[PDB]
Design a protein around this motif. Structure first.
Motif, short mmCIF file in Angstrom:
data_model
loop_
_atom_site.label_atom_id
_atom_site.label_comp_id
_atom_site.label_asym_id
_atom_site.label_seq_id
_atom_site.Cartn_x
_atom_site.Cartn_y
_atom_site.Cartn_z
N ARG A 62 21.59 -29.58 4.88
CA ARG A 62 20.41 -29.89 4.23
C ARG A 62 19.62 -30.94 4.99
O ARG A 62 20.08 -31.85 5.85
N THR A 63 18.32 -30.94 5.19
CA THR A 63 17.53 -31.72 5.76
C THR A 63 16.39 -32.22 4.72
O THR A 63 16.25 -31.63 3.84
N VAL A 64 15.68 -33.07 5.13
CA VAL A 64 14.57 -33.59 4.36
C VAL A 64 13.15 -32.87 4.40
O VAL A 64 12.67 -32.53 3.19
N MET A 65 13.05 -32.30 5.54
CA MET A 65 11.94 -31.45 5.55
C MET A 65 12.25 -30.23 6.72
O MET A 65 11.76 -29.31 6.61
N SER A 95 14.69 -20.21 1.56
CA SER A 95 15.20 -20.56 3.14
C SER A 95 15.59 -22.04 3.18
O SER A 95 15.95 -22.26 4.49
#
Ligand code: MG
Ligand code: MG
Ligand code: MG
Ligand code: MG
Ligand code: MG
Ligand code: MG
Ligand code: MG
Ligand code: MG
Ligand code: MG
Ligand code: MG
Ligand code: MG
Ligand code: MG
Ligand code: MG
Ligand code: MG
Ligand code: MG
Ligand code: MG
Ligand code: MG
Ligand code: MG
Ligand code: ZN
Lengths: 176, 47, 190, 76, 137, 115
Positions: free
Chosen positions: E134-137, E25
Motif C-alpha cells: 500500500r502507498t499514499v499515492m 489497481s
RNA sequence: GCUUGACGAUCAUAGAGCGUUGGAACCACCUGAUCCCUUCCCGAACUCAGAAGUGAAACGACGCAUCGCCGAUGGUAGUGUGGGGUCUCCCCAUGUGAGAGUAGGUCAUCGUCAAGC
RNA sequence: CCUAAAGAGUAACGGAGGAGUACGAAGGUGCGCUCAGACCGGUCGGAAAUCGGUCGCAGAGUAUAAAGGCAAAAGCGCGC
C-alpha cells in the motif's frame, strides 16, 4: 355566535400572551372536516345512503362521499366503489358547529377526563374521534342504525403545535 | 352556498334543566331540553 | 533533503511524452497554483523515485529548482503505470504563505501491543484507513497525524472526531459532517 | 432454439441536415416520439414526423427550458 | 462457488479483453496485495482453490479481501453435437482480468508471512502475478 | 404564491399558440385595485400600445369594478388605432373570461379593433 | 440613474439553503356574499362590491460557497493513414484526442412598456 | 430490443419478448387539475381503507410487448 367571541378577547389576549409583534400570526382555526371511514359496505353498499342522511343532521351541509384510491385485496375491496364520506366546514357553520359540539354534546358523551394534548401533529392541527353517532342532540335514539365512528379534525394557522395548544387553551377546551 | 340541497337550518331553542340557556343555531326547528350542560358538569369544575 | 531538479518542457503530446520515457528516462510534469500560469517541466525518473521512498513525501514542502530559479511546491497528484508501478506523471502545487491548501497526511498508530482490547480480551487491531485529508496553512502542515490505541477495548470503534490534531489543522471530512471509522478491535478470526 | 424472430427496419432518422435548402412539404425527421421538436415553419405528423411548411434552410437549434432540440426553417 | 444471486440474462457474448486496469489497481483495504501482471481469465474454481491455500497458511489472525467476482457466464456445447442448433448451456462463471488488477489483499500479518502466503495462492492461478504494498499515492 | 403560480401555469397554452401563429396580442392584467391592458407586437418583445387605470384622468378612487374596466378598454382601442394595428388576439392571462376581463374585451370590440 | 408591476431574451456560473430588509405608491394578504359567477360538500379555489387593518404569510431586494451546478493546464485511454512484432494483444511515424479527477469559478446578464423620485 | 462497427441498410437451426385485437367513448373541442411514496395526528382497520398536515417532485400513469416520447402534459375530470 363564536365569530364575535373570537375577535373580542381570544384574539386580543393571544396577541400579547405569546409576545407577538404583529396581529395576523395569532393562531386561528380555518376549517373543520368531519370524515367517517366506513370499513363495512365492502360488498353490501347499504350504509352509504344511510351514512349520507345522518351526517347531514349534525352540520346541515350536503356531504360528499369518497371513493377507494387503490385495490388492496386484503380488505376485499378495490377502487371505484365508495368506502367513506366527508364534509368540510368553513366560516359561520364551523364556529356554530364548534359550540354545539363544544358543550351541548361533548359533556354528555359517556366517560372522559378531557381532551388529551398528545393528539397533535408537528404543525398545530388537532384531531379527535367520536365513538358514537347518536351523541349529538340533532338525532333520535331509536330510528338510527348501530354504532358509527364519526370523526373531528381541526386545522389552525399555527406554526407549531404549542401555540396551537395555547390557542385551544381558550374556547373552553377540556384539556388535561 | 348552493341552494335546494341543504335542508332547513335555524336557531332552535336550547335550555338546560339547570336553567342554562344558549341561543345556538342547529337543524331541529324545535326547542330542546338538556339534563346537563357546561355549567353543571363534574369535569368542567373538578368534581 | 526535499529538493528536486526540473527542466522546462516545450514538446507536448502523446508521441512526445512516450519518447521521454523510452529514449531519455525522464518524466513529464506540470507546476500550477499561486497566481501564475501553469508550466510544463521534465524531471528524471531516478530522482523522483528516490525521493518518493521517503515516508512524508506527500505531506512536506519540496523545493523545486526549474532551470536555475527555485520555487516552493507540494506533490498534489501522481500517475503510475497500473502494472509495472512506476511513476508516469506528476503535478505540483505552488505554495503561498497565506493560502489554505489540501494535502494527504499519513497516520501513525502507536502502542498497539499494550492496548487494553488486545492483551485482555485477545482482540486484533484493524486499520480501516491509513491516511486522512486535511486543509491548513502551509506553515503548520504536519508530516504525520498521531493516533494512539492504548485505551481501546474489544469492540470499540475509533472515529475521526476522537483523534486530536495539531493546532491550525482541519480534517475536511469531519468538517463536511461525515466522520469515518479509523480503527477498531474485533474478535479473533479463528 | 426458440428465438428466431425480428421485424422489418423502419428507416428512421434525419433526412435533411443543417444548412440544406428545403421546400414546403419536405420530410425532415422520421421519429418515434419527439427527440426533436417542431420549431418555426415546421409541422408535426400524427406519427411525430417533422415536415417543412415554408422554403428556406434547416437550423437545428437547442433552446428554451427542458433542454429541447428544435428543428426550424430560416431564410436562405 | 462464487456467482451472482440472479442475473438479468442467462447467456452472454464472448467479447474481447483489452486495455489495462486503471481502476481496481490500488491497495485499498489491506497492507499487501497480489496483483495481476498479465491478462487472462479466472474461472471461480481457481479463485476458490487459491483462497483456501492463502487462508490455510496464515492460520492465526489477519483479514483477507477478495477483489474479483466472476460474473460472466460461459457456455459449452455437449460432445457429439454438430455446429448450430442454438447456443450451448451455461457451465461455469468466470472473471475478466486485465494487467494491473489487484486480486487478493491481506493485513494483520508480517510482510514475510504474507509474501509466502501469496506464493501458495499464485501457484493455482493461470496468469502472472506480483507482490505489492500500500502507498499514499 | 400557489394562487398566482397556478394562474401562470394556466395561461401558458394560449400564449404559446400565439407565438406559433405570430399574431399581435392584447394582454390583460387584473389586480384587486386596478386592471391593465397591453398590445404586444409578435414575439413578446415590444409593447406597441398600453392603457390602464393609472392614467392621470382615471385616478379617481373607484378602479376595481366593472365600469372602470370599460373605460380603459374603449381607451386602449383608440391608442391601438394610432399605432396602426387591428386584428389582434385576446389573451386572458389565465383569468376566467367572465367578469372585469369580459367587460374589458367588449369595450375593445366596440372601440374598433376586431379579434 | 433609483423603486414597483406587465411582457420577453437566456435556461443553474442564473438553482437550493441560511440571515437581514421593503409598504410613499404598486402588489399581496383583508371584509362581506346583496348583486353576475362557483363548489360532484365548503366564497378553500373561480367571481363580484371596496379599503377599515398589516407587511405576519407570499413576493421582491440585498449578503454568505455549506450543497448543487460550471471548470482549466498537463498526463492518460481510444482512434484515421503507413509500417513492424514475441500477433486472443501491442509497438513505431504522422494527424487527432476524451471521460474521470486537480487548481479554481458561481448567490447571474440583458430588452420594451407603464406608474412615482 | 441486441447483434449492427455513433447517417440508412446488414446474416446465422444467433440472444430475448409480443401480435392475428380493443374503444360510439378509450374519438373532437372548451374549461379545469396533478402522481407514486414517506412521516406525523386521528373510532372499530392498523404496515396497507377514508380524513388533516409536511416533504416529495414523476421514483406514478399511458387499453395492449419493448423501445423512443409525454407540462401547451400525450396523464386525470366535467359540459357540449
Ligand atoms: Mg496527451
Ligand atoms: Mg501514435
Ligand atoms: Mg431493428
Ligand atoms: Mg394532424
Ligand atoms: Mg464471439
Ligand atoms: Mg389545458
Ligand atoms: Mg487533457
Ligand atoms: Mg494501421
Ligand atoms: Mg489529451
Ligand atoms: Mg474535463
Ligand atoms: Mg463532471
Ligand atoms: Mg446504423
Ligand atoms: Mg455503423
Ligand atoms: Mg438496420
Ligand atoms: Mg447478405
Ligand atoms: Mg387516451
Ligand atoms: Mg415507456
Ligand atoms: Mg370530453
Ligand atoms: Zn346545565
Amino acid at each position: 355566535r363564536l365569530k364575535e367571541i373570537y375577535r373580542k378577547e381570544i384574539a386580543p389576549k393571544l396577541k400579547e400572551e405569546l409576545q407577538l409583534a404583529n396581529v395576523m400570526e395569532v393562531p386561528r382555526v380555518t376549517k373543520i372536516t368531519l370524515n367517517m371511514g366506513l370499513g363495512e359496505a365492502v360488498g353490501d353498499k347499504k350504509i352509504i345512503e344511510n351514512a349520507v342522511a345522518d351526517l347531514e343532521k349534525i352540520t346541515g351541509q350536503k356531504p360528499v362521499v369518497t371513493y377507494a384510491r387503490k385495490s388492496i385485496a386484503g380488505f376485499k375491496i378495490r377502487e371505484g366503489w365508495p368506502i367513506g364520506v366527508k364534509v368540510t366546514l368553513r366560516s359561520d357553520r364551523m364556529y356554530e358547529f364548534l359550540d354545539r359540539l363544544l358543550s351541548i354534546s361533548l359533556p354528555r358523551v359517556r366517560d372522559f377526563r378531557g381532551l388529551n394534548a398528545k393528539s397533535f401533529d408537528g404543525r398545530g392541527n388537532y384531531s379527535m374521534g367520536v365513538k358514537e353517532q347518536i351523541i349529538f342532540p340533532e338525532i333520535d335514539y331509536d330510528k338510527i342504525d348501530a354504532l358509527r365512528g364519526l370523526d373531528i379534525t381541526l386545522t389552525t394557522t399555527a406554526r407549531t403545535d404549542d401555540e396551537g395548544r395555547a390557542l385551544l387553551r381558550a374556547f373552553k377546551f377540556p384539556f388535561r | 352556498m348552493k341552494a335546494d340541497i341543504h335542508p332547513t337550518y335555524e336557531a332552535i331553542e336550547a335550555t338546560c334543566s339547570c336553567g342554562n340557556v344558549i341561543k345556538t343555531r342547529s337543524t331541529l326547528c324545535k326547542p330542546i331540553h338538556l339534563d346537563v350542560c357546561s355549567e353543571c358538569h363534574p369535569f368542567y369544575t373538578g368534581k | 533533503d526535499f529538493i528536486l531538479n526540473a527542466q522546462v518542457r516545450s514538446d507536448l503530446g502523446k508521441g512526445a511524452s512516450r519518447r521521454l520515457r523510452r529514449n531519455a528516462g525522464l518524466v513529464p510534469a506540470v507546476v500550477y497554483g499561486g497566481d501564475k500560469e501553469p508550466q510544463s517541466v521534465t524531471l528524471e525518473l531516478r530522482e523522483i523515485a528516490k525521493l518518493l521512498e521517503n515516508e512524508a513525501a506527500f505531506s512536506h514542502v519540496i523545493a523545486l529548482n526549474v532551470g536555475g530559479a527555485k520555487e516552493t511546491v507540494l506533490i498534489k497528484a501522481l500517475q503510475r503505470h497500473p502494472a509495472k508501478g512506476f511513476v508516469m506523471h506528476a503535478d505540483f502545487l505552488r505554495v503561498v504563505a497565506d493560502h489554505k491548501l489540501t494535502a494527504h497526511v499519513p497516520l501513525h498508530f502507536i502502542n498497539e501491543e499494550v492496548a487494553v482490547g488486545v492483551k485482555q480480551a485477545g482482540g486484533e487491531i484493524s486499520h480501516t484507513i491509513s491516511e486522512v485529508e486535511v486543509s491548513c496553512l502551509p506553515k503548520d502542515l504536519p508530516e504525520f497525524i498521531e493516533v494512539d490505541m492504548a485505551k481501546v477495548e474489544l469492540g470499540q470503534i475509533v472515529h475521526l472526531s476522537d483523534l486530536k490534531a495539531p493546532k491550525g489543522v482541519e480534517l475536511v471530512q469531519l468538517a463536511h459532517g461525515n466522520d469515518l471509522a479509523v480503527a477498531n478491535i474485533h474478535a479473533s478470526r479463528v | 432454439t426458440r428465438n428466431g424472430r425480428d421485424s422489418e427496419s423502419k428507416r428512421l432518422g434525419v433526412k435533411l441536415f443543417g444548412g440544406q435548402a428545403v421546400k414546403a412539404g419536405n420530410i425532415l425527421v422520421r421519429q418515434r416520439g419527439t427527440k426533436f421538436h417542431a420549431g418555426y415553419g415546421v409541422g408535426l405528423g400524427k406519427d411525430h414526423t417533422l415536415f417543412a411548411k415554408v422554403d428556406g434552410v434547416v437550423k437545428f437549434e437547442t433552446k428554451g427550458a427542458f433542454g429541447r432540440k428544435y428543428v426550424s426553417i430560416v431564410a436562405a | 462457488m462464487l456467482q451472482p444471486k440472479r442475473t438479468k440474462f442467462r447467456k452472454q457474448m464472448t467479447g474481447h479483453n483489452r486495455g489495462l486496469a486503471h481502476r481496481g489497481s490500488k491497495v485499498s483495504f489491506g497492507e499487501y496485495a497480489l496483483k495481476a501482471t498479465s491478462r487472462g481469465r479466472l474461472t471461480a474454481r481457481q479463485i476458490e482453490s487459491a483462497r483456501r491455500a492463502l487462508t490455510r497458511h496464515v492460520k492465526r489472525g489477519g483479514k483477507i479481501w477478495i477483489r474479483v467476482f466472476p460474473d460472466k457466464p460461459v457456455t459449452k456445447k455437449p460432445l457429439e453435437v454438430r455446429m448450430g442448433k442454438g447456443k450451448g448451456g451455461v457451465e461455469y462463471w468466470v472473471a475478466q482480468i486485465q494487467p494491473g488488477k489487484v486480486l487478493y489483499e491481506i493485513e494483520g500479518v508480517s510482510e514475510e508471512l504474507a509474501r509466502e502466503a501469496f506464493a501458495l495462492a499464485a501457484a493455482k492461478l493461470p496468469l502472472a502475478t506480483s507482490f505489492v504494498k500500500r502507498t499514499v499515492m | 404564491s400557489v394562487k398566482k403560480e397556478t394562474r401562470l401555469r394556466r395561461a401558458r397554452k394560449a400564449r404559446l399558440k400565439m407565438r406559433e401563429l405570430e399574431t399581435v396580442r392584447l394582454c390583460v392584467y387584473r389586480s384587486s385595485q386596478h386592471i391593465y391592458a397591453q398590445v404586444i407586437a409578435a414575439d413578446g418583445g415590444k409593447v406597441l400600445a398600453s392603457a390602464s387605470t393609472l392614467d392621470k384622468d382615471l385616478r379617481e378612487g373607484a378602479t376595481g369594478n366593472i365600469d372602470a374596466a370599460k373605460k380603459v378598454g374603449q381607451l386602449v382601442a383608440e391608442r391601438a388605432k394610432a399605432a396602426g394595428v387591428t386584428q389582434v388576439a385576446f389573451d386572458r392571462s389565465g383569468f376566467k373570461y367572465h367578469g372585469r376581463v369580459k367587460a374589458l374585451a367588449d369595450a375593445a370590440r366596440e372601440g374598433g379593433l376586431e379579434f
